[PDB]
Write a protein that binds this ligand. Structure first.
Ligand code: FAD
Ligand code: FAD
Ligand code: TSS
Ligand code: TSS
Lengths: 527, 528
């Protein structure tokens, strides 16, 4: 048994061609990579949102500069997720209700909270807010972004210079085809259109070959399952159980479409919107000339017909003739992502609703971990176990985080919102909440330098949902600590000199609002 | 209801005065601190090795620059620990035995392995070593330090500039009095010389007051137990069990002394030496004009005078007129470090043999965690439990790492060394060892910039035993992965451009050996 010579990727979606590119690049010249792709019924481009380390962990690894892949994938910019109507009762409407003398929205941005005297700014904010010396919401106090996104500002100046961390909106299909052109033309990855009919296992349970409907036989040392929800290798052949996590997350379906948009009349929003509905929530993902939107809902509280009506009524579309994608979801993960010589990547591995833009991240996180734990033909079980462990906490921490959005929403107005609250949080989530209520940071980053964070994948992986995110969502929803951090009573000079830090955020808010172009103005100049 | 107003620290050894300093500085003007310390028979200054974040996480916190406290405490410099005779049978001697045409030593330095193409240098070194492309030991292949340490070089040039990460050797008593001066004269900590006679608990089991032999009563909101191994508050007053962990560590005793040394004829060694013995190991901690040494041994494999003799023979000392400290200690940690309103700090909290220079680190790492989890008079149970969780991971991870020095030693030549190979590793440690054999890094540091690591306590705390330390020790002892990392066979260009990384080390280790003063020469420049 020596090094891995041949790899077969089954599936050609976004997960499949990311796997081909990432492995083709990481193993360039030392493995023969073949990807089998069957023709499928095409779907509408309903948009995908990403996170900053898509450029630094994935496209940079491939050697592809941001502007080369954005121009082909007709991409727009994402500075935040804006959460609309999660605290107020009513119908599913794109317009924000009023709450406390302002619109009912909050932002989850990408910046990291600045440390002041070893303590995150979130704790100083809560200190003032608790003692009644401020009523400003958490996000507006601590981040510059909310003010400039309220104004649809660009994250780059017209000279290109970057003023905030950002990620991307795009149609996943265009990226998949950009990558297929890249893997096949630049990395030697070989594309074969064919449909798997039968998987041959040996007496050790490993995959020996796949036989296509053509009668061609593909053998390989390592098999990457990118077949999506079907899991034609990890689940069908290897029989690995799927853990259903509907005791943590009730959402299991979506209806989505794509809406033309006049960017010169209305501008382009530099964020993804997550709009609370009666039985779930709706995404809006701006792109060029159009936006993708989808209603993620719980089949147990809304029939598909009601969801379609709620979804169409909200965008004033025809429930009968609007081209819709109707989807039923597998929510959860495999008991183990990698079994024998079969690695699952993408939705064949795990799926959670895209409330925090993790779909694509789960793909290239797993491949980074796959290469880090790359085997040889002896398939040392410790590599397989280590990988599985990383994939397991990556998903479960996200499941936990996403659940908190529903658990801590104060809404009680529909059976869906009342039911979410009846679920139990996972033990590791409950323990984080206890910490948060006691005034401590949750997974505070070691440094507050965002380049170190978003530029170093292991630093960000080891601390993916950090204190800034927890505050954004938890404080946003209105769950706040029972009392300030007790150290702050012993730090009379820190709590006074901290005002100059909040005032710095305000100076940035005011100055960036006056000098930045709108996102649309910036997009036009690019092209 | 309300903030902590009054703290009482019981114990004024090294742990107490750091606790006074650190807490006195972190709560300045917002809490009254009293330290209560009894007249005890003092010990010989047997010396203490430290680690670089002593400056960045403790003295820098106090605002005390490195030059001020070094000159006052007669401190010398530590670049590494040198492990001697861990791989060869024989008696306890200070001279390295011979092994594969070289001396039987290896070093554990403070650097971090450079990354090359996201993979640590250790993986490329083992690649070559396993394919026969090299026979050079890991520590000499990957670190500049070993060559310059072999020549007792200084980590600083005579103009001051720092060419290596380093820490300190000093006599703990001197650092304690320096901190007692600092806390009492500049932080307002009130020092009371008296003996604890009675601890008064309230109905919920918390501590209400301690009464002294002179009849004085001191009350407080928070009690910090620095009474050493006695544990007068945490163990005796609060009844918190001590968890003995000699099923992982056999060493429970020591015999230690201070030996005078001719620095003008032999220079000053810039490293702690850990010298393997028949029934344990011996530290040597060089200072100015002298060095601390101590034989750490297992009372179940050597009687107390078997040890005194082995130890006096190796240093050519007279067993009958040499002043000797003899201690039997408890090994392990409290079930909970903090209970009620009582926080243990120092050996009242936990203890492991000083094979890796952790004892003082445990004091200020815990003080750091204490301030970060600082309570108010309602003593939120979540603050206590997170604190206790951080303390026990700190300790258990060190307990494991230390056990591995004895477990993977190849020696089989005394009951002691053969007895180490029949203990179990803790499952977590066993798991890291499996990863190591599989070619993987172990707790690889997020970055390879050592400033970001030794300068950011949170960074180092979350990653305290990083992959560099595991390779220094396991590869040093001769435990090496079953095969090279499977990724290296897929990275033709990486394994060829790595030759320039090993060459950069070879150049830097050749160039410093010619340009660096001896440590001695540097030491004389600072003191007058
Ligand atoms: C409806 C939907 C909406 C989503 N929306 C978002 C979003 O808004 N934001 C976000 O971040 N993420 C979103 N995601 C997650 C998204 O799918 C990620 O892009 C994910 O990484 C894609 O993984 P995948 O390609 O495995 O999924 P799939 O698209 O399910 O992969 C299916 C592929 O499997 C291949 N295949 C299957 N069977 C065979 C066979 N027998 N032979 C050969 N080939 C076969 C086909 O080629 C097909 O292209 C969404 C996912 C879905 C399904
Ligand atoms: C043998 C040995 C070797 C070591 N080597 C190293 C090394 O190489 N590197 C390293 O980094 N660290 C080392 N250490 C670290 C060691 O753990 C630190 O020195 C430790 O933090 C100091 O011990 P302590 O102050 O907790 O206990 P002690 O010094 O025992 O504290 C005793 C104090 O407790 C007080 N006290 C006790 N009982 C009472 C009472 N009833 N009433 C009032 N006061 C009381 C007294 O004031 C006394 O002063 C070593 C320790 C030992 C023991
Ligand atoms: N460390 C990245 C966490 C993150 C995931 N999705 C997000 C959306 C907005 C802001 C941060 C995130
Ligand atoms: N993170 C520092 C770990 C360490 C403890 N003791 C040491 C001695 C030498 C080198 C590193 C260490």
């Amino acid at each position: 048994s020596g090094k891995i010579d041949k790899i077969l990727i089954v599936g050609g979606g976004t997960a499949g061609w990311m796997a081909a590119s990432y492995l083709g690049k990481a193993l360039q010249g030392t493995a023969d990579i073949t990807l089998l792709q069957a023709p499928d019924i095409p779907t509408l481009g309903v948009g995908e949102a990403t996170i900053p380390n898509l450029q630094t962990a994935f496209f940079d690894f491939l050697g592809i500069p941001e502007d080369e892949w954005m121009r082909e994938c007709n991409a727009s910019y994402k500075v935040a997720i804006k959460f609309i109507n999660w605290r107020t009762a009513g119908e599913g409407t794109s317009e924000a209700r009023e709450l406390d003398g302002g619109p009912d929205h909050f932002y989850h941005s990408f910046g990291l909270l600045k440390y002041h005297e070893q303590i995150p700014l979130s704790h100083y904010w809560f200190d003032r807010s608790y003692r009644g010396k401020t009523v400003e919401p958490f996000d507006y106090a601590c981040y510059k972004e909310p003010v400039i996104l309220d104004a649809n500002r660009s994250p780059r100046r017209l000279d290109g210079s970057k003023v905030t961390n950002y990620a991307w909106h795009f149609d996943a299909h265009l990226v998949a085809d950009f990558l297929r052109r890249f893997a096949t033309e630049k990395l030697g990855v070989r594309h074969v259109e064919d449909r798997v009919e039968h998987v041959q296992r040996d007496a050790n349970g490993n995959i020996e070959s796949v036989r296509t409907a053509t009668g061609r036989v593909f053998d390989a040392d390592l098999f990457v399952d990118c077949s999506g929800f079907r899991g034609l290798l990890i689940n069908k052949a290897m029989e690995e159980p799927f853990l259903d996590m509907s005791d943590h997350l009730l959402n299991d379906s979506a209806v989505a479409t794509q809406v033309p948009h006049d960017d010169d009349a209305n501008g382009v929003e530099p964020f993804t919107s997550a709009i609370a509905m009666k039985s779930g929530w709706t995404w809006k993902i701006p792109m060029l000339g159009r936006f993708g939107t989808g209603y993620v809902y719980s089949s147990r509280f809304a029939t598909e017909d009601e969801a379609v009506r709620e979804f169409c009524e909200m965008w004033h579309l025809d429930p009968e003739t609007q081209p819709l994608n109707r989807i039923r979801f597998r929510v959860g993960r495999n008991r183990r992502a990698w079994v024998g010589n079969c690695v699952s990547i993408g939705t064949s591995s795990c799926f959670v609703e895209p409330l925090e833009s993790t779909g694509i991240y789960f793909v290239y996180a797993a491949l980074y971990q796959l290469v880090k734990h790359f085997p040889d033909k002896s398939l040392n079980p410790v590599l397989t176990a280590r990988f599985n462990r990383e994939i397991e906490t990556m998903f479960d921490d996200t499941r936990d985080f996403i659940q908190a959005h529903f658990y801590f929403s104060p809404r009680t107005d529909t059976p869906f919102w009342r039911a979410n609250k009846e679920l139990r949080l996972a033990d590791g989530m409950q323990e984080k909440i206890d910490m948060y209520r006691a005034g401590m940071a949750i997974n505070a980053p070691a440094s507050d330098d965002a380049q170190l964070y978003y530029g170093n994948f292991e630093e960000e992986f080891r601390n993916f949902w950090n204190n800034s995110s927890y505050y954004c969502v938890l404080a946003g929803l209105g769950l706040v600590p029972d009392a300030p951090s007790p150290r702050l009573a012993h730090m009379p000079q820190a709590t006074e000199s901290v005002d100059e830090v909040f005032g710095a955020v305000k100076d940035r808010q005011r100055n960036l609002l006056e000098t930045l172009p709108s996102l649309h103005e910036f997009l036009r100049q690019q092209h």
